[PDB]
Amino acid sequence: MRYPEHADPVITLTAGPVNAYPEVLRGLGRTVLYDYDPAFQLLYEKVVDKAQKAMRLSNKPVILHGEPVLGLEAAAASLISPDDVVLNLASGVYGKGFGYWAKRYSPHLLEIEVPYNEAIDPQAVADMLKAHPEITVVSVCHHDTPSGTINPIDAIGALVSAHGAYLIVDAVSSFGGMKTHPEDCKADIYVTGPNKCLGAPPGLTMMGVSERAWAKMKANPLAPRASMLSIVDWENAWSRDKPFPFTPSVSEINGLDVALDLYLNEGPEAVWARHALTAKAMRAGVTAMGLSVWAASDSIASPTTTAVRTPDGVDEKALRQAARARYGVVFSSGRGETLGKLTRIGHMGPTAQPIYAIAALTALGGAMNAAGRKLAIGKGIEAALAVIDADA
């Protein structure tokens, strides 16, 4: 049998979007209220409170009403002034990408760039900060998703703080799937969204903003105002007694309310543990069947996405097509520099269950062997299962 391209797949095991939690799908269909209805104003306030609790935040996170690329661009537009000296950290497609936004708001850009399967060495950051005391803003991506690798943002953040500089973090593809919070890395702007590990659809930004960052942006006359890119306009909009700059995405808010309920109710630690175990099992299965994990070492491999290097002579696009057509299972391509060079299996929210690593490994193995490889698929499943049983 074959699954046609026009029809739904059986399992989406991508690095996001994945199908949302079923409770969230239902939550998206909640009553759409007028945004100035007193019941919605109370709801919105409560959703901000739930976000604050989930993000372990000492102050209110800001919800912005676009998918997290809005928070990332807006953070650059608001926190980076033309006299700032920005140090961008790039270990992948998104990290490198952020440097273009920094360059938009300040002409002074320093960068540390490493190969796109490695992580940023905190010591290289320390060295650069010593060499360049004029640095005022540092930007970093936690999980550079097209690579399935993790940067040590907490150790980086402590150094940035040591040098009196501001920190911007992209935690879009990491928050909720591992232990990470604005406080943990001393972030001044920490950008995430519910559309990766939190198992909601794209549409909203969750942004932690330090009191120091508030002061800086508010004093910046170039910080966007009366703009979709404005953070400062949203400063008090959490409050049931205050207006919204423009109409909030009411249905996405209902979905986020549910996503947060699920996370808080399951218990964030339990949620992180199942992501990490699923990815661990996946990596063990990948290695045991005769494939290689992309990341240069296992210690920097993401618990929320496994990237698998494409063997020579293997068309990565035909591989993904074959996994879907044969087995109903969808994986992600790479992006930019990793496009064509690896395949990505997400472990995110509802897909972060070890049984899905088993399903992923089988579909991946199957498609590889269809392409003429001779993978030990059984050995792979057994290695992944040994990982799961060892944790039991």
Added chain:
Amino acid sequence: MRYPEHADPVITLTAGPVNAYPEVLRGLGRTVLYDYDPAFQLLYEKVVDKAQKAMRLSNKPVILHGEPVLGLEAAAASLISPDDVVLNLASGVYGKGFGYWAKRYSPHLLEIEVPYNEAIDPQAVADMLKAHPEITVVSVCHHDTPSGTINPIDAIGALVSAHGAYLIVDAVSSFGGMKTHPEDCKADIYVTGPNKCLGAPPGLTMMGVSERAWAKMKANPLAPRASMLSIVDWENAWSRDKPFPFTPSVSEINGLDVALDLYLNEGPEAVWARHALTAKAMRAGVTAMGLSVWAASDSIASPTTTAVRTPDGVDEKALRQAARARYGVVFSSGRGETLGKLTRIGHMGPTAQPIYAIAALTALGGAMNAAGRKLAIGKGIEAALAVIDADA
């Protein structure tokens, strides 16, 4: 009895958000696909084709992934450059407000302004264009929702076209609820969204873009690129064979698919008729009970919102609060310079059914008489019902 503020209302009869069509609420909970899944790529293309059909467009409309203020700001940012002289037409809050974005992107701003219960006079527009050959861009709002009034954008669009200028039209709160389309008014940029008459929640923009606007925007060095504010980035994103600039709002696209299906299957003309009839019934009831429609004349009054002038002396905020606490019925306040001046009752998509005019009339009249007025509520119901019964 009284309805708690924290509790959900009975009927939301605002000028938007209103509750989405029940089908759209379910559509919102459809499977969330990977955006690069072939079934999603095909869906996305066929949603643009549905929008193209609904908008009677000769070319593809652009869907942008923010609620339509994004379209308005992006249209300014991309089309207007400092070489342009902009004529902004302002008969209300949104028309006036567009001039502020116009002024952000060119220092040359001409305006025609009328009080916020009137419409722009096409003869005034013709006279202004003749007197100012230097005008290159004209902006206009079709239904300036906070006043519940309509501008003659088709006659205006034709004058503007003869002049040789670009037309930017805000049709957010009119499209789907009355006869209007980009090529009816020769619009270069026509911004609408499904969050008013089409009965979907806030979060997407549907934009008609003329070939001439494409060329102007793509030439402009100051037009947003690699930005949430970018129209140009999204030009080819309709195609199943092309990437998305950033992750589309998958659930909102699902809701929009359904909303377009509903509109196209019911028949646009039939849909416009029931908005007009609901509104006509509303105005007749308002007048008969002893209130005044805000609009300077009945001929410019919107078929998708009835604004009702607050009697001098009546506290409009307390009135709306009373309509909800007593009757469970929610109305919109005015906005900006109409706030405190009028109450608004939307007739939009699911609420554009004449029986909701009856409910609205009784709650508004009920609240008014509790504020000490002495309205002829029964007379008002009978006049609205005569309009319903007369409908040939």
Added chain:
Amino acid sequence: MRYPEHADPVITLTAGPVNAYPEVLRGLGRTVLYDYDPAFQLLYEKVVDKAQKAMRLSNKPVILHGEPVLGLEAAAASLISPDDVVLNLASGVYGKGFGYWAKRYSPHLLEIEVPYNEAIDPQAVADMLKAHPEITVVSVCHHDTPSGTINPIDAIGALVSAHGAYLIVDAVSSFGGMKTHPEDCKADIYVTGPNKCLGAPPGLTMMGVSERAWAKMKANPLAPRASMLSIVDWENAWSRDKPFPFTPSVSEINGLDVALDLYLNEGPEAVWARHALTAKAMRAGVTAMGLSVWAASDSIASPTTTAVRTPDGVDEKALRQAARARYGVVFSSGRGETLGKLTRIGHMGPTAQPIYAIAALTALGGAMNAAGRKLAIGKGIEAALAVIDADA
């Protein structure tokens, strides 16, 4: 305009089914678990607990897996033995109807029957019980819905208990819309369901069963066993540690879970008060416009349904057709003896909001006047609104 018969109506204002609460519609789409899954076994136990709390019950109510006609037939089949002498009370279509089931299980049937717009006089019941001391079982319908009238079941129940007899109550169309509970009327079997005032779809029975009734049925060798009609087989099925006689309606259970949440959370007293106020307003509007409430006196009129007598020369079926085609509003016909003689407006769960009485009155008036009546429709709305405002 006209609403076609094939398409959805705008408002269903029937005596049931009405559209379910929106939370319940969503609840129906909850994950369907295996019925022997430990999570479902816990859920089922919890839903029985919620039912017990809502019904003010000292022991566990039994959930049966068919709409309440199952509970009614099964109560007759299990509680009425061939040597029982049954006194059936009939003030309408359902009360009279129950006598046929009693006659199925015992040849000894006494009846008190009154006209189908009146209620049972508790004194007539007292008189009959004195005249017939051999009576062992008494059956009564609380709200004989096709008549929109209420029997004094608490006063009847105290008398039945005084004479040592068993009481069967049909509270299908009353429980949840007024103060009524198995304990209140001393019922031995009290049959209701969530498909009227509780605002869920048809599919389940909620049955209060006295310890005395348990003893009787269990000792009855004719009580259905290994049967859809069995009550005794379900005795312990509430328990997470016990099997289900056959597969429970898992989705209906999810809907009931939500329906009960809504009722308990709103507060049963507040729920009863809004039903009673909506019906009161309706009756006042009916009388003021020149129509007559069916019930022989206002004191026996149901708070959960208003029945309106059809004027001479008026085709009741054409009337309902006209209300739906003109205004999008659906009413119920009568049944049996009341078919053709009255129209029924339910006030049940989500339709038990006074604004819906206003909508109902207008549609009813409108259709009457289309049929050549000359109703004072305005006066009707004003009288209903005066009722609502008097309660404010």
Added chain:
Amino acid sequence: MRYPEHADPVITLTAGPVNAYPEVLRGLGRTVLYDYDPAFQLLYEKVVDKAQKAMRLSNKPVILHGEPVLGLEAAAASLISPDDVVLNLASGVYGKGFGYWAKRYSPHLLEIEVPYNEAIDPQAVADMLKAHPEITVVSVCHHDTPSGTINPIDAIGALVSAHGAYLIVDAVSSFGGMKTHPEDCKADIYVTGPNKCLGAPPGLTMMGVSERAWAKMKANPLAPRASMLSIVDWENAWSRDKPFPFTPSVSEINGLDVALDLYLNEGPEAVWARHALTAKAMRAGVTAMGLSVWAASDSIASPTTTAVRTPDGVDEKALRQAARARYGVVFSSGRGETLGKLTRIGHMGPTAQPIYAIAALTALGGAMNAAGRKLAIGKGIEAALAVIDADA
């Protein structure tokens, strides 16, 4: 990690209930209409027509409003009278169980019984009919779910027809998942439901009834009338111009409408192929890892359920508990005389996709090896995948 019993599982891979198709979960939340609303009357008729098409029926199937045990009991109660001599065929729990209802409605019961891993032998059936001209009714179960085995009902139906007897077929767990229809097996009463392979929840019965069965049931004074157990009451209820004996399960009808659409649109043959392929893959994996399929032979093994014999010595209950606690995967126990003897993995509607066989194999093998077995799990996955890859 471990999955809490109170918490929802990851994958329900039982022999029913399984989670409904996502479309069906949404269908369940469609508008609940008044059952005498013309749009509902029309819906109900068109759902019977869809069922008629799906069942390849020459006449209307009857929908009964209880889960299919209602159909089975009603079929006995209505068709079998004490003049009948019944031959009940029992190869498992449900076949044996039907004889108990047969014996309730006629004292004359003949049986052919085989052990609960075998199928009925048609030659034995032919021999029995020849030896007993007095047989007038024959009962048979197609897929006796607790054994995961199939009877040759088409050959049996033909023998029974030649004899001159009535055939009652239980196809609850086979219809929709393999080639079977009332007129394939000359069924007089063919009972199925959408709660297994059609992927809807429990609560409705779909019954094919021959014209001869109609005449026999309608003649029988002991056939249930004015009863939940009545087939005859529901004869004309398909028609939009006819009443319902009692209130139909409106939401379940909505779910069924969707389930029929899915089945008919996918194409029944394609649907049967994917159940067969999933099951074939499952059996191959079970055998390769070192377990035994319960069925006496592969040829009688069901394409909609694989029963796996518990190794002697293994605690089957603890095993299922372990598969859920370790892997989040839920299997069915056996029932009655198969309880403790085997574990069941359903391949039904949404779970009939070969990738779920892979997940099931890994969880079952995983649980077994935790119970001390030494299965070749990888071998098992590779054998199941060879079957998937071989599928021409």
